[PDB]
Coordinates of C-alpha atoms and ligand atoms in Angstrom, one line a residue:
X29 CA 16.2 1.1 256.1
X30 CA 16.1 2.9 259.6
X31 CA 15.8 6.8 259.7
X32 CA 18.1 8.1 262.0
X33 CA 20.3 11.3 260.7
X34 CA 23.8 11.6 260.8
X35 CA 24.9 14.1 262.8
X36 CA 25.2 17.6 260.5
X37 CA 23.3 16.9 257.7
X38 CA 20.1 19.3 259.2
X39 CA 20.8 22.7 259.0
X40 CA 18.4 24.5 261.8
X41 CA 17.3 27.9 260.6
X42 CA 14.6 30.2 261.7
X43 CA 12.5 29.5 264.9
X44 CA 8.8 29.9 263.9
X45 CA 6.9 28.4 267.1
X46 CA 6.5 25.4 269.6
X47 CA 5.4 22.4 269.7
X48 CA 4.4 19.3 271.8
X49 CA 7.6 18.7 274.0
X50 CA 10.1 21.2 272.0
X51 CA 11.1 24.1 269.5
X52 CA 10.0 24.3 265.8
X53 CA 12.0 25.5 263.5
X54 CA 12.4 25.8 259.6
X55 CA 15.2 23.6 258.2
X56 CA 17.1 22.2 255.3
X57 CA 17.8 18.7 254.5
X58 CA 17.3 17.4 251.4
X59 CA 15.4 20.7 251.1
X60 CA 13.2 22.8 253.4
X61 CA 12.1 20.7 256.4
X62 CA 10.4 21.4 260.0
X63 CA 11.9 20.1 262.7
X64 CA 11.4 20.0 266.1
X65 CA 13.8 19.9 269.1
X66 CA 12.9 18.1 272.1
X67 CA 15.3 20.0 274.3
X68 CA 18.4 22.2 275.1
X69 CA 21.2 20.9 277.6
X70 CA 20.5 17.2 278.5
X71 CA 17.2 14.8 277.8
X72 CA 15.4 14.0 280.9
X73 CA 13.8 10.3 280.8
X74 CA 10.7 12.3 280.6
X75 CA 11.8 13.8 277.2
X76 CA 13.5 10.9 276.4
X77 CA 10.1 8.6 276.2
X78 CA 7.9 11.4 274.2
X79 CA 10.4 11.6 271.6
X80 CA 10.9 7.7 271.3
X81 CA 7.0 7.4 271.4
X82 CA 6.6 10.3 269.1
X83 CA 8.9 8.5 266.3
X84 CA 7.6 5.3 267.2
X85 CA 4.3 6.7 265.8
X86 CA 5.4 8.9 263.2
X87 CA 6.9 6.0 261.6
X88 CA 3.5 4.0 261.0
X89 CA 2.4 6.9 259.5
X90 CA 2.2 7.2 255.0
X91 CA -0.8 9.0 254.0
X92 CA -0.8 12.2 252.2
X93 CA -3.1 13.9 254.8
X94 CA -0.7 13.5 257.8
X95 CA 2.4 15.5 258.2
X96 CA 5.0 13.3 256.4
X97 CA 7.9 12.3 258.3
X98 CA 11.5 12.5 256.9
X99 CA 13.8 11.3 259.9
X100 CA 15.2 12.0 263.7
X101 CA 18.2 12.6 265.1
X102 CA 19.4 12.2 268.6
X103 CA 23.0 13.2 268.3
X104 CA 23.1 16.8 268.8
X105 CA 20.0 17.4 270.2
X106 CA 16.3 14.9 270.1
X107 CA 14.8 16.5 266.9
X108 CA 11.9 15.5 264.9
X109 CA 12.3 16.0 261.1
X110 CA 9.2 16.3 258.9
X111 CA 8.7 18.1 255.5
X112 CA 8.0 21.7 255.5
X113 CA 4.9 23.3 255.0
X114 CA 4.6 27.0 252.9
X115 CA 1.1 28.5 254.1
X116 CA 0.2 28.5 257.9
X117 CA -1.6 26.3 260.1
X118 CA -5.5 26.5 259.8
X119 CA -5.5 28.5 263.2
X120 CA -3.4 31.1 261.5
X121 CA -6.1 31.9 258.7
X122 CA -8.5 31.4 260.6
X123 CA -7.7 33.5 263.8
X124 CA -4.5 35.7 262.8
X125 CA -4.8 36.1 259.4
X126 CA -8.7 35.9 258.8
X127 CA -8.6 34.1 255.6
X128 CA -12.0 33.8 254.8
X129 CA -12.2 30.5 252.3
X130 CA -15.6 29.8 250.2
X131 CA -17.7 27.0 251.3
X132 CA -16.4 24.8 248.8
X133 CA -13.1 24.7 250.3
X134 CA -13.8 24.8 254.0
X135 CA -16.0 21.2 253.3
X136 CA -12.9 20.2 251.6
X137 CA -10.5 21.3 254.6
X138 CA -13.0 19.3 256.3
X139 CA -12.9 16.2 254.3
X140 CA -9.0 15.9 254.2
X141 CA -8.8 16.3 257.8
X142 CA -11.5 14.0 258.2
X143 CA -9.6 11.6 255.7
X144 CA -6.6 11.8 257.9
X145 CA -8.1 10.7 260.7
X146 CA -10.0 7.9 259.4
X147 CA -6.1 6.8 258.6
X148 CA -5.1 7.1 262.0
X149 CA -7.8 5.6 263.6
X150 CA -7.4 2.7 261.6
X151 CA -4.1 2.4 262.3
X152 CA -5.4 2.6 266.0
X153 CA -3.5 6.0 266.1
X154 CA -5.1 8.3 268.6
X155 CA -4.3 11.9 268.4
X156 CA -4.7 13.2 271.3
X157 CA -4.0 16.4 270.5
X158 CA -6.5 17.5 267.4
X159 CA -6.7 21.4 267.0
X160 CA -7.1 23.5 263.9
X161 CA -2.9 24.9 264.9
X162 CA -2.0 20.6 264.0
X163 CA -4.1 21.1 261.1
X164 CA -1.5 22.6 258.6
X165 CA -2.6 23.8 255.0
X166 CA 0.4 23.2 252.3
X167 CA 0.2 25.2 249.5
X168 CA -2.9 26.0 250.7
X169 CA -4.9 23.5 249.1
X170 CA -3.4 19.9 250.9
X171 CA -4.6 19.4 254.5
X172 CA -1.7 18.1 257.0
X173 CA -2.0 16.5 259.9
X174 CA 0.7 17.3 262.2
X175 CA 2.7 17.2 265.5
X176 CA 1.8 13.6 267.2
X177 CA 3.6 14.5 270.5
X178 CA 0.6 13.7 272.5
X179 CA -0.3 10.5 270.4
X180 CA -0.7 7.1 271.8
X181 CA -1.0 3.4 269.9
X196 CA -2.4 22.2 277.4
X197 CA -4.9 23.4 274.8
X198 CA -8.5 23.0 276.1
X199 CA -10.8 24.3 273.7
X200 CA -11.3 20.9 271.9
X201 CA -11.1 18.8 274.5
X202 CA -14.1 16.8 274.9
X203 CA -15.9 17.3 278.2
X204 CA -14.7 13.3 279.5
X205 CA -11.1 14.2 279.1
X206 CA -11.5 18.1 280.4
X207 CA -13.1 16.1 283.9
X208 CA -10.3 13.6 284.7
X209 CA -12.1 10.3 285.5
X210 CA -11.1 8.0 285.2
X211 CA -7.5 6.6 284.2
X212 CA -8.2 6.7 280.3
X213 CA -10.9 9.3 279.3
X214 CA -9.2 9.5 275.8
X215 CA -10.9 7.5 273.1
X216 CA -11.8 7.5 269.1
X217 CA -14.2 9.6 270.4
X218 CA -12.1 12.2 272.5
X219 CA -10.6 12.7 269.2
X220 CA -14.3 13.4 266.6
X221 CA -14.8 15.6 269.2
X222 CA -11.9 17.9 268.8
X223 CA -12.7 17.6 265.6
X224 CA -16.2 18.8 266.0
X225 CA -14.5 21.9 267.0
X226 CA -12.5 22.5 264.2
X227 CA -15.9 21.9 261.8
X228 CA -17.1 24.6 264.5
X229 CA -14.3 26.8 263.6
X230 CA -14.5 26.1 259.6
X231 CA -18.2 26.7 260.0
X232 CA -18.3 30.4 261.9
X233 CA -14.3 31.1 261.4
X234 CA -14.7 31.7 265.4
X235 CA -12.9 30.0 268.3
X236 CA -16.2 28.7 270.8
X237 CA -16.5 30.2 273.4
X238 CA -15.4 33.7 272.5
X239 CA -17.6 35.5 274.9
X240 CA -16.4 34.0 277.9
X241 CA -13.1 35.8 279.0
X242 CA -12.5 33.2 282.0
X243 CA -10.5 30.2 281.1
X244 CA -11.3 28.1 284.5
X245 CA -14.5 29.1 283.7
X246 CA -15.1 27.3 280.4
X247 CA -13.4 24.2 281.9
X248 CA -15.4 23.8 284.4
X249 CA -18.5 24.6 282.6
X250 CA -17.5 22.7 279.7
X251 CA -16.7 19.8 282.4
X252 CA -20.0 20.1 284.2
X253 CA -21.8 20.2 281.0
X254 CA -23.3 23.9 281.5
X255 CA -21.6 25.1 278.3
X256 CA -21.2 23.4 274.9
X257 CA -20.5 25.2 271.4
X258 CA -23.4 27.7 270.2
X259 CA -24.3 26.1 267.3
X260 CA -26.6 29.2 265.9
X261 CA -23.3 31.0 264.7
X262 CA -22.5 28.7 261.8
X263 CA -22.7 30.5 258.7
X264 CA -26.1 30.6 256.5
X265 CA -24.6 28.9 253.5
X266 CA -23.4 26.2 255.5
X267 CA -25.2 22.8 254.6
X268 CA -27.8 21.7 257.0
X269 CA -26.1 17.8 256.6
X270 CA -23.0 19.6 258.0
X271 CA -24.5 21.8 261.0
X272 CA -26.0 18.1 261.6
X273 CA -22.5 16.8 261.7
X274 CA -20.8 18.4 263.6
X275 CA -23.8 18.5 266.6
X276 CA -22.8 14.6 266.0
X277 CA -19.1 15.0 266.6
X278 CA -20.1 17.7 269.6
X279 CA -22.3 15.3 271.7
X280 CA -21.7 15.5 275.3
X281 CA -21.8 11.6 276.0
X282 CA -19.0 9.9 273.9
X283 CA -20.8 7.1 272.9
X284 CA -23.2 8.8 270.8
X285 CA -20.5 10.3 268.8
X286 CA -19.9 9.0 265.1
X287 CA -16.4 6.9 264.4
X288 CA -14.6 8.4 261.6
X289 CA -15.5 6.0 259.0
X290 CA -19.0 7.3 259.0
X291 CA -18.2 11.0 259.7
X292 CA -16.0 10.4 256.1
X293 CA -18.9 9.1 254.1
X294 CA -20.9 11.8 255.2
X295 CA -18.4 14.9 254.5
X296 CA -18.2 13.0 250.7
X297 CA -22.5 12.9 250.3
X298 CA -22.8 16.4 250.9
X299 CA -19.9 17.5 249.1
X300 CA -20.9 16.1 245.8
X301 CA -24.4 17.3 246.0
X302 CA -23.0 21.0 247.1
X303 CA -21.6 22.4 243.9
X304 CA -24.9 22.5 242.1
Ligands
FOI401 C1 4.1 26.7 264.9 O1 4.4 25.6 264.0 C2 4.5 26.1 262.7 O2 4.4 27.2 262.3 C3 4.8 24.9 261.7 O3 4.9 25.2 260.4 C4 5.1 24.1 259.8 C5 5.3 23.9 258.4 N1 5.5 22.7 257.9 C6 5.6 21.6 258.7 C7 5.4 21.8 260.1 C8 5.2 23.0 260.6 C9 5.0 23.6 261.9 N2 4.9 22.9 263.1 C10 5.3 21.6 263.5 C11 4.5 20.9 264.4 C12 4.9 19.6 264.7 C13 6.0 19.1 264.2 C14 6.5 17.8 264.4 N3 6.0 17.0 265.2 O4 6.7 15.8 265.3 C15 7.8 17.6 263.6 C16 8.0 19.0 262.9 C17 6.8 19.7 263.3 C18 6.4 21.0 263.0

């Protein structure tokens, strides 16, 4: 049953990026696969929890929204084997790239990723780490949610305002996490990261902290819905509890969407 791999079976190939405690890189094993390696020379303890809690997670985890994961193996090196992804994370076309999708299909990147979530959450998986470079497209039309290094049972542009201010023990919540995901509606909605004006990162967390700065909300697109623009100002609200839990931030991605193509 267990999903340990025997040592050599994964064949690393190319290095393609980072990710939450290690090295990604494109593999084969049983096919193409990503995996990620927790370390070089010797695991600290430190590495040594993140990866068991990583897998420990991973493994409560079948839904075709979140990054499917294949196995781990400790032998060689702490790796993290998933399936592999063609197409870039939603970062890349958004940012890099500059894909520029129709409406249609950034509701639906929505309401996959939004899907996703609902699963986790559920599941009382918190993420943690929500951020439009987890958020993989695969063959481009099959949202991913990946990477679950952070994820409990760096990167500060969607971190709500009550995690950015540490206070007190445990500022992340269901919450924390729709409002990261506020932020990648943000980004679907004006293909911009927030905040581009401000050149100061310190800046925008203390600001974002204070609660002197919050997404400009004016910059969403004109043919974006009026239900979604109402949304995501839901998701984006400064005091947690007046955010929406993803069951009812679903149901509302699904209204609009069937009363959009028309
Ligand atoms: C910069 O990253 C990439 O370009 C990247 O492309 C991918 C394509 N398919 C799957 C995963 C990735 C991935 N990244 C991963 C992020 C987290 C991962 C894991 N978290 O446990 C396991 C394999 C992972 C790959």
């Amino acid at each position: 049953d267990d999903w340990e791999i025997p040592d050599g079976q994964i064949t690393v190939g190319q290095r393609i990026g980072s990710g939450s405690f290690g090295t990604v890189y494109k593999g084969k094993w049983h096919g193409d696969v990503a995996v990620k390696m927790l370390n070089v020379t010797a695991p600290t303890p430190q590495q040594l929890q993140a990866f068991k809690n990583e897998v420990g997670v991973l493994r409560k985890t079948r839904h075709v929204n979140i990054l499917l994961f294949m196995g781990y193996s400790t032998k060689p090196q702490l790796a993290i084997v998933t399936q592999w992804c063609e197409g870039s994370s939603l970062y890349h076309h958004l940012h890099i790239i500059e894909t520029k999708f129709e409406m249609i299909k950034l509701i639906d990147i929505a309401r996959q990723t939004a899907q996703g979530m609902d699963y986790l959450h559920a599941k009382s998986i918190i993420h943690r780490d929500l951020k439009s470079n987890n958020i993989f497209l695969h063959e481009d039309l099959t949202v991913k949610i990946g990477d679950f290094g952070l994820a409990t049972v760096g990167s500060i542009l969607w971190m709500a305002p009550e995690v950015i201010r540490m206070q007190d023990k445990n500022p992340y919540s269901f919450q924390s996490d729709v409002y990261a995901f506020g932020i990648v509606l943000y980004e679907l909605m004006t293909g911009q990261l927030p905040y581009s004006n401000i050149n100061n990162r310190d800046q925008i967390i203390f600001m974002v902290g204070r609660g002197y700065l919050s997404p400009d909300l004016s910059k969403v697109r004109s043919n974006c819905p009026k239900a979604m623009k109402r949304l995501m100002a839901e998701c984006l609200k400064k005091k947690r509890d007046e955010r929406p839990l993803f069951p009812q931030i679903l149901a509302s991605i699904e209204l609009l969407a069937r009363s959009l193509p028309k």
